[PDB]
């Protein structure tokens, strides 16, 4: 616990004062639908839109209130918007506006044009270890930030990590993020990325994010996840078994880090010991990482996405376009009153 650790501590203290102000007094109803021209679907929904008054492009997430109710996601959706409007960190996508109408909820975020990490990783096959380390370091700092605010993220995966014009990561989709000081119990996440304590229906805490980091680093460096199969149940059987196999090109340092992150024993999992995140940040695999330089975006990125111009979506897949219908009757008003 030296001078560098005290500075992190003080930085996180100021970050928490700012977060809590917005957490306790959330912003609400800061734009309306006809402020935007709708361009194209970016994921399924999230749409590219253009703000008329400024000409800025944004990514607008649209949720059908009736479908949220049927899927029992009311409280998770209130979590997502309340957390997103309160956070502020370089590697988190920024929420610029939110609002609702008779049918839908809307979250309008900064447009990140470089595409999902998922698309680049699948196309290239795998990332080199320096490449994967660059991205992993950003997730390490982002979880240090989120966890210090008593937030658990619970859906880390390449599909949710966007590459910006500087080649850095922006985390999107807070649909399962939750502020909780005790343990929690919800069965949620993506199968390949679930910690064993989730699968086995135990109480669990922020250590599930550090397990998921282990899955992410493995998938970036290997090109495939550490546990995969054609059916989710078969994936879960592999996750709880306690064994992991590594590609032969994995360095010795990388395997040792992943055995400590993909650790079924919670009393032994990195990120969850007395030293907290510093067991990770001081691991030999991260010896060349300058954490301050990463935070300041001063490190040279592995690649810069192709940019054809404003509003171009060539780094995203194409999706079938569907109408945005707004009923003449208010749906689910009481359930979403605080949104």
């Amino acid at each position: 616990k030296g001078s560098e650790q005290e500075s992190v501590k003080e930085f996180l203290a100021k970050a928490k004062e700012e977060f809590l102000k917005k957490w306790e007094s959330p912003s609400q109803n800061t734009a309306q639908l006809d402020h935007f021209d709708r361009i194209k679907t970016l994921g399924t929904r999230v749409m590219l839109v253009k703000h008329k008054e400024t000409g800025n492009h944004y990514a607008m997430k649209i949720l059908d209130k009736q479908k949220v109710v049927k899927l029992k996601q009311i409280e998770h959706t209130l979590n997502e918007k309340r957390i997103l409007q309160a956070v502020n960190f370089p590697f988190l996508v920024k929420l610029e506006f939110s609002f609702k109408d008779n049918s839908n909820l809307y979250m309008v975020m900064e447009y990140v044009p470089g595409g999902e990490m998922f698309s680049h990783l699948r196309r290239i096959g795998r990332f080199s270890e320096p490449h994967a380390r660059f991205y992993a370091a950003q997730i390490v700092l982002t979880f240090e930030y989120l966890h210090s605010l008593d937030l658990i993220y619970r859906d880390l995966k390449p599909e949710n990590l966007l590459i910006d014009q500087q080649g850095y990561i922006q985390v999107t989709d807070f649909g399962f993020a939750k502020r909780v000081k005790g343990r929690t119990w919800t069965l949620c996440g993506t199968p390949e990325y679930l910690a064993p304590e989730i699968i086995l229906s135990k109480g669990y805490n922020k250590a599930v994010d550090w397990w998921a980091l282990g899955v992410l680093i493995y998938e970036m460096a290997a090109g495939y996840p550490p546990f995969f199969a054609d059916q989710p149940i078969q994936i879960y059987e592999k996750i709880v078994s306690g064994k992991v196999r590594f590609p032969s090109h994995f360095s010795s340092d990388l395997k040792d880090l992943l055995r400590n992150l993909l650790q079924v024993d919670l009393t032994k999992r990195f990120g969850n010991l007395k030293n907290g995140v510093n067991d990770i940040k001081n691991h030999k695999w991260f010896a060349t990482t300058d954490w301050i330089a990463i935070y300041q975006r001063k490190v040279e990125a592995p690649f810069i996405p192709k940019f054809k111009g404003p509003g171009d979506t060539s780094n995203f897949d194409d999706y079938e376009e569907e109408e945005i219908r707004v009923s003449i009757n208010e749906k689910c008003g009481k359930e979403f009153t605080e949104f």
């Binding site: 699948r122 599909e159 649909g175 996440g189 993506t190 679930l194 090109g223 054609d230």
Partner: peptide
């Protein structure tokens, strides 16, 4: 190879939350 097994599997596309 494990890569070949992954590429021929049904879970190389985007994965939905549970």
């Amino acid at each position: 190879t494990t890569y070949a097994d992954f590429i021929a599997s049904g879970r190389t596309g985007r994965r939905n939350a549970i």
